[PDB]
């Protein structure tokens, strides 16, 4: 809508106060004019019709319980935009400042969130398995990163390519979480998963086997469920990424950690320059090694650590 750019205030899903960019025209709308072609957040009103109504508020204060998922969808879309622009010089998910549109209160008791090809969609959870999923910055950024992947490599969402697709989204979801300093960690979805259980998450990048996911190529899932194990076998790549950043010794292979910024630069270059729709784990290793070579030189520690990490998870 046309109006005046304003700054409102509210609380997110976890009860934390934050400022949000809004637009005033009779009502205050969740329309952020400060980022690209805009960030727009919508009320799906417990239906499955999308996008729903652009979120309108009478007083620019967003402290109602019903407001909280919208506050976080809107705010964390902005954080994700800032990460890709400031760290990778990428303008929105398509690199052309596409508007980022999000709908909250999708369906009833819906334990999921997704990028649908043109917008983000967030369920509210059933209150036992999940609370509203936009409360997790890593969820928001994980799903927006699927759009980045779609507009670049086009990784196919099955088998090894699909596991790489998932891992890329976990990697950048986590790097966004660290960028925001929003209680960062190397687990996924901890802020919105199982409110009655502390210390858990959907999966761990630092220790995938904590939840039974494989941390070595020899332990990969080879069946047909989950599109060939895309959320299971992602642990193999997630652990390699963790090792590249933080270092460690894994299955007897020592990895010299090079930090989060260099992890992000190596994988972003691999994703945008070298991966293809059917890249497998071995081809991802090659893309990461070449990316680190481009950035840091063939004799660099960074290249050596990429090789160590993929060795440690059994990917040649
Ligand atoms: O923490 C990371 C920071 O060090 C880097 O500069 O940008 C990405 C963040 O995840
Ligand atoms: O278990 C890991 C711990 O050893 C390290 O200190 O920080 C990250 C954790 O995942
Ligand atoms: O081949 C071994 C692999 O199967 C195991 O999982 O990790 C150590 C490797 O040496
Ligand atoms: O069966 C597939 C397996 O062959 C591959 O190695 O990893 C993904 C699986 O879906
Ligand atoms: Ca209000
Ligand atoms: Ca996390
Ligand atoms: Ca929990
Ligand atoms: Cl470990
Ligand atoms: Cl381990
Ligand atoms: Cl480790
Ligand atoms: Cl180990
Ligand atoms: Zn998802
Ligand atoms: Zn995903
Ligand atoms: Zn966290
Ligand atoms: Zn799955
Ligand atoms: Zn998923
Ligand atoms: Zn280990
Ligand atoms: Zn380890």
Descriptive labels:
Thermolysin; zinc protease; 5-stranded mixed sheet; alpha+beta; binds calcium ion; Neutral Protease, domain 2; binds beta-D-xylopyranose; hydrolase; globular; 316 residues; binds chloride ion; binds zinc ion; alpha/beta; 18% strand; monomeric; Elastase, domain 1
Q: Which shape, going by the Cα principal axes?
A: globular
Radius of gyration: 19 Å
Secondary-structure element pattern, one letter each: EEEEEEEEHEEEHHEEHHEEHHH
Number of domains: 2
Number of beta strands: 15
- Give a short account of the largest sheet: 6 strands, mixed
Which fold does the CATH topology of the largest domain refer to?
Neutral Protease, domain 2
User: What distance lies between the first and last C-alpha atoms, to the nearest angstrom?
Assistant: 52 Å
The helix content is 25-40%
Find the CATH superfamily of the largest domain: Neutral Protease Domain 2
Bound molecules: beta-D-xylopyranose, calcium ion, chloride ion, zinc ion
The CATH C-level class name of the largest domain: Mainly Alpha
> Which CATH architecture of the largest domain is right?
Orthogonal Bundle
Strand-residue proportion: 15-25%
Total number of helical segments? 8
Would you tell me the structural class of the helices and strands? alpha+beta
Function: Extracellular zinc metalloprotease.
EC number: 3.4.24.27
Binding site for Ca(2+) 2: 138, 177, 185, 187, 190
Cofactor: Ca(2+); Zn(2+)
How is this structure best summarized?
This protein is of the alpha+beta class and 316 residues long.
